[PDB]
Amino acid sequence: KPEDVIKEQCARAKVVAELWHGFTGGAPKAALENLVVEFNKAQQGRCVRPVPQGGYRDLSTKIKAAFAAGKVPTMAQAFENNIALYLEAKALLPIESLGVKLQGVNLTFLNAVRFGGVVYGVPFNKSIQVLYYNKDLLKKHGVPVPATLEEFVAAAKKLSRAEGGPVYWFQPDASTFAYFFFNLGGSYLKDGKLVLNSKEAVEALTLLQNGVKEGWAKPITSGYINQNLGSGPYAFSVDASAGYTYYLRAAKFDLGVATLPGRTKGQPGYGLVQGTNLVVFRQASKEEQAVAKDFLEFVLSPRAQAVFATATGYVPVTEGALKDPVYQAYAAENPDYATIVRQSRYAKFEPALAEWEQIRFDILGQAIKEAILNKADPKAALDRAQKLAEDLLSS
């Protein structure tokens, strides 16, 4: 196993830089480990040790405990809102001071790690939402891949009627909500203030709740969508590009990947950007930080980017990745990699507020579950979310 090879590499190493992550397994965990094994081989007495912390929520809980225990790793994965939280504690090294070169990092991704003009993270494993679909089922009913929200609803209705069950599958969560909210003209910040209960928020949540009532949308309440496949007819889902390998292994049908339905055919829908940046903690030693500098330079290299992104369906974060022949060979044999990069052009983020992790799961996510699972009124559910978010922010 690659994590055994790493335990061994670090055992002989003069300096070990720990990297805490939230990859539980599959292609992402494996791709991270393969990258680390290759880096660790180039060094003499200098190594990275990846340490799985569970999922992403677990990782930020454990990073907060590590601050309270006074023992943080050298590097960790972080969302933009976690970077914001760690900056309140002044806990992050500025990346460009470390000596990492950022020319050629995608500005979509670089702007998101820049706080008061200073970059505090290295875009690493950046996902974009895509439309997964059942190529077999759309072909059986002569339904084209939908390019607009209108067409998507119409297709889900037609196919659900035909197959006797709801064919648009979704988790009732903030990530799914974001797709429909952004594409109905929603924004979360109104003159600097967080608003969860805007008319576009009510519209988005009402669209999903109506799709359940109308028999075209299927709430997935236990596991990833890709873990529920094979139970009833499936046409479509909106999911992160990093689910690609999970969908591929699970699907008994011919899986497709398309750009997201938008307001019009003039442009694909916006997708939510997910996945994480790597940060470097101030508490690391000069020697651990030097390992981080070389590790981050390696992760931004065209070949590392090419291998990582083709092994997983993460978006390659540099312009040079798309010029690498290994990326080019993968793309030539599989049109889904270009589809994911094309979608990555039409990209929105959630707010970069320190409290956003709590808000998205415990407040916004709960309001969406209330509406979807318990037929709560959408406006009443989001009005309660607004008050709980304002109270949290005021505390």
Ligand X SMILES: Nc1nc2c(ncn2[C@@H]2O[C@H](COP(=O)(O)O[C@H]3[C@@H](O)[C@H](n4ccc(=O)[nH]c4=O)O[C@@H]3CO)[C@H]3CC(O)(O)C[C@H]32)c(=O)[nH]1
Residues contributing to the site for ligand X (CB under 6 A): 23-24, 26, 28, 56-57, 60, 79, 81, 125, 127, 173, 175, 224, 226-227, 240, 242-243, 246, 274-275, 356-357, 360
Q: Shortest Cβ distance from residue 243 to ligand X (Å)?
A: 3
In this complex, which beta carbon is closest to ligand X, that of residue 246 or of residue 327? 246
DSSP conformation letters of 277-301? EEEEBTTS-HHHHHHHHHHHHHHTS
In this complex, which beta carbon is closest to ligand X, that of residue 9 or of residue 60? 60
Residues 94, 56: contact at Cβ < 8 Å?
Answer: no
* Integer Cα distance of 242 and 21 in angstroms: 15
In this structure, what token pair is assigned to residue 97?
Answer: 């001071």
* Integer Cα distance of 201 and 185 in angstroms: 9
* Integer Cα distance of 386 and 243 in angstroms: 31
Q: Shortest Cβ distance from residue 221 to ligand X (Å)?
A: 12
Pairing of strands 46-52, 75-78: unpaired
**Most distant pair of Cα atoms in the chain: their distance:** 64
In this complex, which beta carbon is closest to ligand X, that of residue 100 or of residue 353? 353
In this complex, which beta carbon is closest to ligand X, that of residue 160 or of residue 339? 339
- Cα 131 to Cα 80, 128, 247, 258, 262: the distances in Å are 24, 10, 12, 5, 11
Q: Shortest Cβ distance from residue 144 to ligand X (Å)?
A: 26
Residues 368, 202: contact at Cβ < 8 Å?
Answer: no
In this complex, which beta carbon is closest to ligand X, that of residue 241 or of residue 318? 241
Q: Shortest Cβ distance from residue 280 to ligand X (Å)?
A: 19
Residue 375 DSSP symbol: -
- Cα 295 to Cα 181, 285, 380: the distances in Å are 37, 15, 48
In this complex, which beta carbon is closest to ligand X, that of residue 115 or of residue 224? 224
Cβ-proximal residue to ligand X, closest one: 127
Dihedral class, residue 124 (left if φ above 0, else alpha if ψ from -120 to 50, else beta): alpha
Q: Shortest Cβ distance from residue 239 to ligand X (Å)?
A: 6
* Integer Cα distance of 247 and 257 in angstroms: 10
Closest of 308, 317, 298 to residue 41, by C-alpha: 298
In this complex, which beta carbon is closest to ligand X, that of residue 302 or of residue 313? 313
In this complex, which beta carbon is closest to ligand X, that of residue 151 or of residue 173? 173
